[PDB]
Amino acid sequence: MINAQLLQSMVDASNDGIVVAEKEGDDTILIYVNAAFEYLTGYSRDEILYQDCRFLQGDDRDQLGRARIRKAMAEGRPCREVLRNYRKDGSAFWNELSITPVKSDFDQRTYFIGIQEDVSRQVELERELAELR
């Protein structure tokens, strides 16, 4: 019954960004992005496919989650980090990124799934709540 087209529709219905990246040395390049990722980042699939997602950090590269992400990937572990990210138009947003390793039928190829949740509203709500409390 269920087919690849239906799973594709499921992935494109996600409110969170969903991507797959493939390890290419020190890069992990996008090989799949869903519609939510395009909307969240302001980049179209064609203009960022086969790039490392670190472009979302812009010039804001002094972020502690980077080293933990690299280490988790190297050790084949999942990880989750809240990162400062920037859309194509430069607008800032808080990105709660969840990275999961993938088991494939080709172990020589190493893939990671990324889930991007825009947590900007939640961060601001926590900030006001701390300011009033």
Ligand X SMILES: Cc1cc2nc3c(=O)[nH]c(=O)nc-3n(C[C@H](O)[C@H](O)[C@H](O)COP(=O)(O)O)c2cc1C
Residue 70 marked as a ligand binder: yes
Q: Which is nearer to ligand X, 34 or 116 (CB)?
A: 116
Spatial neighbors of 59 by CB under 8 A, at least 6 apart, are none
CB 111 within 8 A of CB 21: yes
CB 90 within 8 A of CB 58: yes
- The CA distances from residue 35 to 10, 30, 79, in Å, are 11, 14, 23
User: Which residues lie near ligand X (CB under 6 A)?
Assistant: 19, 21, 26, 28, 52-54, 56-57, 66, 69-70, 83, 85, 95, 97, 99, 112-114, 116
Output the smallest distance, CB 104 to a second copy, in A. Answer: 7
Residue 3 marked as a ligand binder: no
Q: Residue 66 binds which entry of a second copy, ligand X, none, with Cβ cut-offs from 5 to 8 Å by kind? A: ligand X
Q: Which is nearer to a second copy, 15 or 44 (CB)?
A: 15
Coil, helix or strand for 116? strand
